[PDB]
Design a protein around this nucleic acid. Structure first.
Ligand SMILES: [Cl-]
Ligand SMILES: [Cl-]
Lengths: 98, 83, 211, 96, 99, 81
DNA sequence: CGCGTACGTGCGTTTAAGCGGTGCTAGAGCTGTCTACGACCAATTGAGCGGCCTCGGCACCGGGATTCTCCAGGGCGGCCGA
DNA sequence: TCGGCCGCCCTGGAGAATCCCGGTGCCGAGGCCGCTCAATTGGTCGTAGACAGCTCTAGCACCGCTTAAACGCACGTACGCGC
């Protein structure tokens, strides 16, 4: 059989690889479709500058990365290495957005 | 055409990449649906404010300045697009 | 289950039995259905609804002094009822069981082609055992309709009844919301009047095709 | 000794009597309502001033205050306040 | 013959008693001494209005009650009913105050 | 002039935690809580004394503490405003 | 410390994101006209604020009902072990 | 074959705490009066913005390749979770 790694080693390798990188991790076009879908329920026929959707994507990914940082701290605090919706809800509750 | 089911466009590997940038080692299965929910509510608030800024500017195109003003108003100041 | 619709050429007035209601909603909403009333019989233990009825509703309503007074002879004497409704402004179980007992008197027997309609109302703060028991007694499942489309309060409601089109038809309006916003007591009318007038006319909408 | 610190105390009391005619209010709760009015005031006038600076304008009209209310109040509270405000501006612009 | 309760019942009784009350739980004079002690390291011979120290106490107790709320949520989240400095540090970290 | 942080007593921190809903309190809570309270009071009194300095006064008014707490995003009602 | 389950890794499959092109047009964006809407000034006056008062709503002591807490006992297997 | 202790379920009654109900005092909120100064009205300009028109930017739309990456399936073992 061919070579196969442990889970922790490729997991930590990806943690290192993506904390070094700066590019946008969510793809541009499905995020744009999501933005138009959410906008649709406020006004029909809305237009968007490209830099506006890029700004939305930068802020959304930064927000979700800070969310996963607090979620990882909640997981680690609960003697676990697995993040859970318990951990996401605890994070958002302590941050005050519930 | 009315756009629907675009929250699934936030795919499972993209949420895993976001988790890696946040330092997460192991990710359970309900994380992806919960994360799509949280990102949906965040974009609801932000796009709601940006659309409001567009409404008062007598325009129909949401500029980057509108999204910057909106994020800044919510206490999350975004650099790179003005302000 | 679907009931056959009589054509609108037969205009017979609607006989209503409303059992528990603080501010009398059913007769006023039937006045703004555009159709006439056959018999409207009300009753209340307290005298507040009696005072509101003797001041406002001009005396076109047959009142009973107590809910513990209506027997089978009163139902058979005051004409057959087409609609039976039970709502409210640990007595909720008492209200439901008095409602179900008076409902058994007003239900037509096996063989009558009279269109029968009933409705029972209470919020989602009920104990789940009382909910499943009421689902057993009425042989109908409630629908959990939340005040989240038109409102933001955490006050959802279960509905029971024999109403055509009551599963998922209710949605949020913008014009009715806009016209109902213009008050400084906007959310007090949202807590009371929005549960009184619009939801009830929304659920009892298709009765004008019958009569 | 002549200095009058302004407040919204009589107006909070008048709106309370116009809502609850038999319920009074203490002076500490009156101070809390005064500071709430001052706070919300500063918030809306702040957002309006920011909006006016954003849109290269120097005149704060009812539309600026309107979109500041639609920003600051959460949802249905904003809808009720925009309706109440537009109703009072309608009554104002067509009065004696 | 001497009566004694279980821990949980008097604990919950105090939780109810203090979530019903509104009075200030820190005493006035040691909080005032703490305020003067902390102020001392910014300017000598500082004076304070009484309402200023009362405002400090209202905000400080409200801040610590919200902090213990989040700390209790951290404890409950970690399958505990006993709060720990782990829980306080997690709470302050998620709130962004670790500086 | 050093035991003033010990004036925040163990019963008083326990009463605060009861108002916060805490059932059980470990012993290492109390020193940590005194620390966190001291840091919060440092930030607030620092800002309030800064505001007193700008007004060229020697006393700290309640309006100064209101302005400080308002600057720090914790708005306090009932002390002017 | 043991059970398990469910998540990560790897490989094949395939869905579609991304890039590169052009065409079109709604709309951002800048310019001229003017007009109507607001700042600025004085008189006036009545509404809003300082001061006072009195009184009733709130705070508080005491008593009884009650209402949950908790431990003691009675029966009950049941479990052996001496 | 034996009864001596030992955990379980139920129930009962002491027992401290709390809710309810009056009784009395007390002091701050409601209300009345002066007054004083800013709200209001009338009038005058000045220019900010509403509006029409022109333009020309980029935003949306479509299509064609192109592989980058998402989706699915098996599997195994490491951590979640219960005791
Ligand atoms: Cl205006
Ligand atoms: Cl610790």
């Amino acid at each position: 059989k061919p070579h196969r790694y442990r889970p922790g080693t490729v997991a930590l390798r990806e943690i290192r690889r993506y904390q070094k990188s700066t590019e946008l991790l969510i793809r541009k076009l499905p995020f744009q479709r999501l933005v138009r879908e959410i906008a649709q329920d406020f006004k029909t026929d809305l237009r968007f500058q490209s830099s506006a959707v890029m700004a939305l994507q930068e802020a959304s990914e930064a927000y979700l990365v800070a969310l996963f940082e607090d979620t990882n701290l909640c997981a680690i605090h609960a003697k676990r290495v697995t993040i859970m919706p318990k951990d996401i809800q605890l994070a958002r509750r302590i941050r005050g957005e519930r | 055409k009315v756009l629907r089911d675009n929250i699934q466009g936030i795919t499972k590997p993209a949420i895993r990449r976001l988790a890696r940038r946040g330092g997460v080692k192991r990710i359970s299965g309900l994380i992806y649906e919960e994360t799509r929910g949280v990102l949906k509510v965040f974009l609801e608030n932000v796009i709601r404010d940006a659309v409001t800024y567009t409404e008062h500017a007598k325009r129909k195109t949401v500029t980057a300045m509108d999204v910057v003003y909106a994020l800044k108003r919510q206490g999350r100041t975004l650099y790179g697009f003005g302000g | 289950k679907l009931y056959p619709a009589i054509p609108a050429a037969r205009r017979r007035p609607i006989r209503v039995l409303s059992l528990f209601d603080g501010i009398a909603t059913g007769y006023l909403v039937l006045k703004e259905l555009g159709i006439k009333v056959g018999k409207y019989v009300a009753s209340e233990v307290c005298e507040e609804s009696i005072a509101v009825g003797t001041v406002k509703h001009e005396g076109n309503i047959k009142y009973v002094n107590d809910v513990r007074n209506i027997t089978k002879k009163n139902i058979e004497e005051w004409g057959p009822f087409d609609l039976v409704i039970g709502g409210s402004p640990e007595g909720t179980g008492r209200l439901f069981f008095e409602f179900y007992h008076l409902l058994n008197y007003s239900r037509p027997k096996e063989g009558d082609d009279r269109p029968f309609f009933w409705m029972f109302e209470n919020v989602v703060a009920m104990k789940v055992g009382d909910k499943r028991d009421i689902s057993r007694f009425l042989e109908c499942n409630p629908v959990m309709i939340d005040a989240i489309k038109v409102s933001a309060a955490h006050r959802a409601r279960y509905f029971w009844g024999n109403l055509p089109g009551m599963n998922r038809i209710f949605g949020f309006p913008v014009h009715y919301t806009d016209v109902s916003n213009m008050g400084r007591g906007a959310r007090q009318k949202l807590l009371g009047r929005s549960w009184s007038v619009p939801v009830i006319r929304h659920l009892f909408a298709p009765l004008k095709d019958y009569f | 000794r002549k200095t009058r610190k302004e407040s919204y105390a009589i107006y909070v009391y008048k709106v309370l009597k116009q809502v609850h005619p038999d319920t009074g209010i203490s002076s500490k709760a009156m101070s809390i309502m005064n500071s709430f009015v001052n706070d919300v005031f500063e918030r809306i006038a702040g957002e309006a001033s920011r909006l006016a600076h954003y849109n290269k304008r120097s005149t704060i009209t009812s539309r600026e205050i309107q979109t500041a209310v639609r920003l600051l109040l959460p949802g249905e509270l904003a809808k009720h306040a925009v309706s109440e405000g537009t109703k009072a501006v309608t009554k104002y612009t067509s009065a004696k």
